[PDB]
Amino acid sequence: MYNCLHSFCLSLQLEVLHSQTLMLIRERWGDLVQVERYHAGKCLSLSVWNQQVVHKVTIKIDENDVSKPLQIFHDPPLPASDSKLVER
Amino acid sequence: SLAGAAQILLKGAERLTKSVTDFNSELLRLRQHWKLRKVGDKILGDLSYRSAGSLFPHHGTFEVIKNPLDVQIPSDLEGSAYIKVSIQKQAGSPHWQTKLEAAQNVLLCKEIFAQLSREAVQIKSQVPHIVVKNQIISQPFPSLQLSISLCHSSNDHLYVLEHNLHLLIREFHKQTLSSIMMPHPASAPFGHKRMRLSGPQAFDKNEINSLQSSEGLLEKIIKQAKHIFLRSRAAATIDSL
Amino acid sequence: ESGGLRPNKQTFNPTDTNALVAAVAFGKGLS
Amino acid sequence: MFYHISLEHEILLHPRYFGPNLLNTVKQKLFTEVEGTCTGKYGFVIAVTTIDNIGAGVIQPGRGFVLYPVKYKAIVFRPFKGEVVDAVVTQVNKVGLFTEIGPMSCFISRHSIPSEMEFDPNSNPPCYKTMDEDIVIQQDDEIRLKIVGTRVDKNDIFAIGSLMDDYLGLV
Amino acid sequence: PQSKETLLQSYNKRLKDDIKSIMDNFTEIIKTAKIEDETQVSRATQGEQDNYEMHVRAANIVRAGESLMKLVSDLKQFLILNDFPSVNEAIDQRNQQLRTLQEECDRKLITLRDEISIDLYELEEEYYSSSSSL
Amino acid sequence: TINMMEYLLQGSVLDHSLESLIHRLRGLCDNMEPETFLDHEMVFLLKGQQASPFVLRARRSMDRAGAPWHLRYLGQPEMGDKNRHALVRNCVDIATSENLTDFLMEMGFRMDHEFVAKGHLFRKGIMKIMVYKIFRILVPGNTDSTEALSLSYLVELSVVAPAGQDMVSDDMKNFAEQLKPLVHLEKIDPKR
Amino acid sequence: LANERLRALEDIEREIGAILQNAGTVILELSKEKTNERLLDRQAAAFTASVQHVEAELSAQIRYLTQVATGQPHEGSSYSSRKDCQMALKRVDYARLKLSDVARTCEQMLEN
């Protein structure tokens, strides 16, 4: 029951974040942020600081996580260790 | 049998007379103040400035229901909203009248902040801004921090810049719906008046570019804020002196 | 006895239309 | 007559429409062309009540398009020869009477009009009236006309109105 | 024009069907009540049937009158929602009220500004000239 | 430059009903105060070796001070499809200085017929509806005295489209349909 | 527009009257002693006349509608003037507030 509920709510959160990203692309940002790859229930890649005027931000769900907490992954750069900023 | 018939008839008629001797009057009054239209059986009205030249893709269609009548506001236009502009040195009315005025004010504040946030993100300007969710932060002078935030209640502040924001977006609407676009010569096509005068009364580059200037609400507001700060600074300096 | 007509007040005259357009294009009744 | 029948129609779907929502795209597209077009064999088509089934998409070599045979149910209206149908008069003229039956429009020649009936040019609204005024036909009136025959062109059917048969015209 | 022709036709059909129906329902009540000779069916049936029939037709007439009232109200709403000339005149009239209000407010504010400015001038000529000298 | 085609539908209103049409147009059209323009137009024709004389229409706005004369060339009708239900002509619109009359006469264009048009102009989107009463001008040169060509007023719906894409006529037909009960605006061929 | 108001009033009145008439007539129909003979006939005539009148009035008012039942929902609004006036009133209120505050400070000065 916990595994099914967790998978469902995490996929719903992925969908909500994807809708928020497309809404931001539509109105305010306007090509200043892009969607590289979006896999429903697997990962969603957002690219900022484009080459015109690249980096990606992947938000994924892994079946069930017990040994390691499931957080977000900044895949391309792997940002440096900034104690205050990387935590936020 | 005829007794029953007569009884029913009389009851109905007298019921109609009891419903005859102010929904009609209410609806009539609601029309003069707010434009209305007839579709199906759910009569709607206009709650947007689209008549006054606003290019905002939002349907301002508020419903009217019999409950002597009630106005149904579109969702997300409810509550009260007011834009807040602040400088920090760091870094008698009818029941439906109040509802419709508040929802129209919320719609205009959303229009203003959409314009401001888009101009902050996309237009390249000196000392760029940060738009987080509902808050724009700019640094016009290096010791100065200006903040424009759309406070949506959903149930230090300078009024002058908020009032000028409303008037700036109001002039920006009225530029499209202007009588300057009308050509008095019937044959003459359309468009601004001085752009017509540019042909025979020959204009240079500078007048042509001054008639057609690409500026923004954010740029003008920042200029105004900077001027206010400078004035305040000079005043304080002379006072100390 | 539901009478017959009630409002027959014609708004536009087709002869008038023809005349006006004619003038505008060639120039009848103007030279 | 209003007849609810199943039609066999084909859809040419551009590949750009492939991907998400391809099946309802065919359903959505089907309504675009079927509605607003008529055919003599089936008459004017009003609406598609439902889609009975969706066929397999057959590729055309070289073209790249797809052929979807779709079975759908729709109501059609077709004039039949020698039948009487209620009609509405649109415009009244000395040459003939123009009447509309929904999508179908019919023209009534002066000869088909009864001999005793005469055009009323003096009256501001063009109309046909009798000497005794027993029966009067005017624009936007209920009349019944016998269809002499069904004739079609450019996906449009318009027949002749015959008032010779008994129990026809306004009442 | 097509869509205006259709709206007119629908309202007119409502009204025509309506007068015809009220008159016909009254006629059916009178075709009836007429105590005619009975046979076979028997009063025990005829009687109750007639009573029920009269009741139902009375209800029908009342409903047709209610529909008449509804259509009248609809016409009233249409004539206030979108008459067209009256609506244009009313919009022009509200523009008048608003404009006068604006004018009055503007004049008031300007006069206020002038008087306050004169007071400010007096104070600026004072405070600045004050001896004090901390 | 791309060419500018003018889509035109022309119809007439008798004077008695002018008030009803004015109120109606104000309601459907964008909310702008009526322009109430008055203008004088003289058409110049060039009698060259080719039989057809080039026709250039010159317009001066007497009512609006400090507004330039407008010179326009109107092409032959391009109407083809019955569905379009519009009149299509090529059009070039050029604002000109006051010394327009002299330049045209020296060039060789000859003044032919002059008319004065007075009426109201209203606009909806690109569409412009002009309602005007043409007045004949008598005496060789002047605008002081005019006689009415007709009691009725011509109503013309004109769109100066860029000539890119189409369906411009469809929008015009829909708007014309609303005024059709009040006044039948239709495409009337200039010929006869 | 008072014309439409009067029309509606007349309509309602006539309708109520006709249904009262029908009621009375059917009540006299069941009556064992219908004393209102000529009176009853007069009532029938009146009811018929009323229905005819109602019908005619309705048709005429429908035309009055369809003369300008343009279908078009009408664009023209007073939103411009209204918004401007609201802005002006708010500005005057702000001015009044500032004036009151300055007056209060001056009062404070006097109080010492």
Swiss-Prot record, chain B:
Give the tissue specificity: Ubiquitous.
Reading the lineage from the top rank, the first entry is Eukaryota
Task: List localization entries.
Answer: Nucleus
The UniProt entry's coiled-coil ranges are: none
Known partners and oligomeric status = Interacts with GATA1 and PPARG. Component of the Mediator complex, which is composed of MED1, MED4, MED6, MED7, MED8, MED9, MED10, MED11, MED12, MED13, MED13L, MED14, MED15, MED16, MED17, MED18, MED19, MED20, MED21, MED22, MED23, MED24, MED25, MED26, MED27, MED29, MED30, MED31, CCNC, CDK8 and CDC2L6/CDK11. The MED12, MED13, CCNC and CDK8 subunits form a distinct module termed the CDK8 module. Mediator containing the CDK8 module is less active than Mediator lacking this module in supporting transcriptional activation.
Concerning its family, UniProt says:
Belongs to the Mediator complex subunit 17 family.
**Its biological purpose:** Component of the Mediator complex, a coactivator involved in the regulated transcription of nearly all RNA polymerase II-dependent genes. Mediator functions as a bridge to convey information from gene-specific regulatory proteins to the basal RNA polymerase II transcription machinery. Mediator is recruited to promoters by direct interactions with regulatory proteins and serves as a scaffold for the assembly of a functional preinitiation complex with RNA polymerase II and the general transcription factors.
Name of the protein in question: Mediator of RNA polymerase II transcription subunit 17
Species of origin: Homo sapiens (Human)
UniProtKB/Swiss-Prot annotation, chain E:
- Gene Ontology CC entries for this record: core mediator complex; cytoplasm; mediator complex; nucleoplasm; nucleus
Offer one example of a GO biological process linked to this entry.
RNA polymerase II preinitiation complex assembly
The keyword Signal appears for this protein: no
Q: Name one GO molecular function term.
A: transcription coregulator activity
Q: Where does the UniProt entry say this protein principally localizes? A: nucleus
User: What UniProt keywords apply to this chain's record, in alphabetical order?
Assistant: Activator, Coiled coil, Nucleus, Transcription, Transcription regulation
- Tell where it localizes: Nucleus
> Does the record's keyword annotation contain Transcription?
yes
Question: Where in this chain does the entry annotate a coiled-coil region?
Answer: 86-115
Describe the family membership recorded for this protein in Swiss-Prot or TrEMBL.
Belongs to the Mediator complex subunit 22 family.
Give the record's subunit note: Component of the Mediator complex, which is composed of MED1, MED4, MED6, MED7, MED8, MED9, MED10, MED11, MED12, MED13, MED13L, MED14, MED15, MED16, MED17, MED18, MED19, MED20, MED21, MED22, MED23, MED24, MED25, MED26, MED27, MED29, MED30, MED31, CCNC, CDK8 and CDC2L6/CDK11. The MED12, MED13, CCNC and CDK8 subunits form a distinct module termed the CDK8 module. Mediator containing the CDK8 module is less active than Mediator lacking this module in supporting transcriptional activation.
This one is known as: Mediator of RNA polymerase II transcription subunit 22
Q: Where is the organism placed in the taxonomic lineage, from the top?
A: Eukaryota, Metazoa, Chordata, Craniata, Vertebrata
**Gene label:** MED22
Swiss-Prot record, chain F:
Name the gene behind this protein: MED18
Q: Where in the cell is it found?
A: Nucleus
One GO BP on record is: positive regulation of transcription elongation by RNA polymerase II
- For this entry, the protein name equals Mediator of RNA polymerase II transcription subunit 18
Q: Which InterPro entries match?
A: Mediator_Med18
Could you list this entry's UniProt keywords, alphabetically sorted. Activator, Nucleus, Phosphoprotein, Transcription, Transcription regulation
- Gene3D superfamilies the record matches: Hypothetical Protein Pfu-838710-001
> From what organism does this protein derive?
Homo sapiens (Human)
Q: Does the keyword Repressor apply?
A: no
UniProtKB/Swiss-Prot annotation, chain G:
Known InterPro entries for this protein?
Answer: Mediator_Med11
Q: What is this protein called?
A: Mediator of RNA polymerase II transcription subunit 11
Its function?
A: Component of the Mediator complex, a coactivator involved in the regulated transcription of nearly all RNA polymerase II-dependent genes. Mediator functions as a bridge to convey information from gene-specific regulatory proteins to the basal RNA polymerase II transcription machinery. Mediator is recruited to promoters by direct interactions with regulatory proteins and serves as a scaffold for theee assembly of a functional pre-initiation complex with RNA polymerase II and the general transcription factors.
Taxonomic lineage from the root: Eukaryota, Metazoa, Chordata, Craniata, Vertebrata
Gene from which this protein is expressed: MED11
Q: Which UniProt keywords apply?
A: Acetylation, Activator, Disease variant, Epilepsy, Neurodegeneration, Nucleus, Transcription, Transcription regulation
Which disease appears in this protein's record?
A: Neurodegeneration with developmental delay, early respiratory failure, myoclonic seizures, and brain abnormalities: An autosomal recessive disorder characterized by congenital microcephaly, profound global developmental delay, exaggerated startle response, refractory myoclonic seizures, progressive widespread neurodegeneration, and premature death.
Which species is this record about?
Homo sapiens (Human)
- The UniProt transmembrane annotation reads none
For this UniProt entry, what is the primary localization, expressed as one broad class?
nucleus
